[PDB]
């Protein structure tokens, strides 16, 4: 049914399944052969020595076209899909490819498949914004320093586990073609086992858009057969999937009373306990405000939740139905509580129908509705005469003593 | 066809709507059918008695 | 044990499993699936708390 609720319909963490992300999408690039139609030659190793083949590139030739869809299409390990770059290019020059997503994610696998040899110097980037800002992630080179001013295989300090490392590992060829690059950010991080309570790591995994720029007789180029990257849609554990909008926009169907396309905030009128992340121990859900059926808008202050022993901090605004309070939970000046009615009755508040003569004042005990009884008068609305007290038709003093 | 009255809990001077017009009891500078908005020349105030007030 | 703890629920008669009809009083009483009919709340003296049922046959009653 809904994994957001237990066998007993208890709200529990519901998550989209782990899936490849870079599968079938388009990418804007900065360079490609074939315009005008380009050529390219290909070397192969035979036994001990080398031998060079050669081919051509026209995109207008479908069979000689090799679009970036070849990176996102299904790559058959027996029918590869190699996109190709222009040749005769090297550092220092930006070989930049972008991908703007629009949604923040957590990633586990970043797999690759190469048709060209593995170069020496390169780095990783990302954008937690929508294609405007860009930050690196790691570097990769034998000379991480002379190229990037970086160390090779640095250590990950616990106090900054968000360090960006560089290595010469797997910068070698072989593998020339079919290079397999898989990256787990979790490697080396000491606080990766308890990722559920690693917000900086839960921030280190945050990424929306991706950019890749390269630095480092014959025609040399770069080519690649496919790309796969695994992840889950970031709904903070508050939505089991992500769906399209009426204006074509992929958003979480944020369950667990959460708001924001990523379930990042609480739902409107849900301000009593702070927004929290669904944990294996507790789904740390949001909660609406309590008005006992007597308000539609509310606000919150932490000090309320603070002094609540961290239990509640909700407070309603504009208490209707002659009700009032943090929970719109009492009759204002002017009514009393109709105790006979339930504690949330929309008309639980009614005018102090005090005997306009027999009651001394115009109010009544908001709890008891006890009107102000005059000298010898008693009773809630103060109507009755007492023992030995004779009612008089005086519009001022009805009950009169006996000798 | 009948729904409970939604009188503005503050800007209306009562919770009873004018069953014909549904007009809640608008207080001096309060406007709106449920008597919620402040009028032009009345700004919303955090005072729990005078929400809408003229300006000099 | 020694202190108090208060749970809380709701009643829709249109919810069959959450309804609490007087049939809960006439149905078979399972000590493991009891049938709690429920009254309205916020009620006390002085008020008539009356429930009705006629017979159609005169009887002598013991238990
Ligand atoms: C980039 O990649 C593309 C795709 O592979 C290559 O495109 C060329 O495409 C044209 C068709 O647009 C191919 O031309 C073919 O050869 C004919 C030669 O002229 C004869 O035409 C007819 C017989 O077809 C005779 O009756 C006539 O007397 C000529 O002797 C062309 O005329 C034909 O193309 C015609 O067809 C298209 C529609 O298909 C029409 O819009 C035009 O009128 C066009 O003239 C025929 O299709 C050609 O084979 C392709 N070249 C290749 C494969 O190398 C580009 O060439 C490639 N870029 C480069 C630089 O090579
Ligand atoms: C009393 O206790 C019961 C049991 O717990 C609660 O049950 C509710 O029952 C209602 C029945 O109407 C449920 O309402 C459900 O939502 C629909 C929303 O409208 C959509 O309708 C269809 C999809 O159902 C769409 O195609 C359409 O475009 C709308 O988007 C209702 O319309 C449905 O009820 C409708 O169905 C009946 C026939 O079955 C029709 O005659 C009516 O037109 C009726 O509108 C649909 O069933 C609701 O889901 C239940 N809530 C639960 C189980 O929590 C009651 O809520 C409870 N009452 C109170 C006051 O607490
Ligand atoms: C090559 O380097 C970077 C990207 O790797 C680009 O940075 C430019 O920096 C200058 C400095 O003032 C800015 O004026 C440009 O607007 C930046 N370009 C951007 C942001 O695209 C530089 O442009 C790249 N050169 C290219 C792409 O030709
Ligand atoms: C509550 O009290 C009794 C039943 O416990 C009902 O008695 C009424 O007494 C007055 C006094 O003359 C009669 O006029 C009414 O006709 C009686 N009601 C009957 C017989 O139903 C009284 O009505 C009860 N009130 C309720 C049930 O609302
Ligand atoms: C690979 O797929 C393309 C797609 O049309 C097809 O034309 C080609 O024949 C395939 N090659 C092999 C060896 O199956
Ligand atoms: C209302 O009545 C109760 C009943 O004893 C009394 O204690 C209280 O002082 C009265 N006034 C209130 C609650 O304002
Ligand atoms: C309801 O609105 C009409 C519209 O002018 C007004 O005349 C009337 O006094 C209002 N109150 C009623 C009908 O109780
Ligand atoms: C009690 O009986 C009802 C009959 O419908 C059933 O739905 C319910 O599950 C039973 N109780 C338990 C604990 O299974």
Numbering used by the authors:
A (entry chain B): 40 to 255, 271 to 457
B (entry chain G): 402 to 457
C (entry chain H): 86 to 148
What does the original paper state about this entry?
Netrin-1 (NET1) is a chemotropic guidance cue pivotal to vertebrate development, where it plays a key role in attraction and repulsion of axons, cell migration, regulation of cell survival, and cellular differentiation. It is secreted by axonal target cells and functions as both a short and long-range bifunctional guidance protein for axonal growth cones. The dependence receptors deleted in colorectal cancer (DCC) and its paralogue neogenin (NEO1) are crucial for NET1-mediated axon attraction, cell-cell adhesion, and tissue organisation. Heparan sulphate proteoglycans (HSPGs) such as glypican are cell surface receptors that modulate NET1 signalling by acting as attachment points and modulators to fine-tune axonal responses.
To gain molecular insight into the structure of the high-density HO-induced NET1 assemblies, we combined negative stain electron microscopy with X-ray crystallography. Negative stain electron micrographs of NET1ΔC and full-length NET1 with short HOs (HO-dp10 and HO-dp12) revealed long, filament-like distinct structures of up to 5 μm in length and showed that NET1 can form a clustered meshwork. 2D class averages of sections of these tubular filaments showed a continuous, repeating arrangement with comparable outer diameters for both NET1ΔC and full-length NET1. This indicates that the positively charged C-terminal domain is not involved in heparin-induced filament formation. For both proteins, the layer separation along the length of the filament was ~54 Å. Crystallisation of the NET1ΔC filaments revealed many features reminiscent of the filaments observed by negative stain electron microscopy. The asymmetric unit of the X-ray structure was composed of 8 NET1ΔC molecules, which formed with symmetry translations a double helical core 200 Å across. Crystal packing yields a tube-like double helical structure similar to that observed by negative stain. Remarkably, the monomer-dimer equilibrium of netrin-1 in solution is abolished in the presence of heparin oligosaccharides and replaced with highly hierarchical and distinct super assemblies leading to unique, yet unknown netrin-1 filament formation. Moreover, our data clearly demonstrate that both, NET1ΔC and full-length NET1 can form filaments.
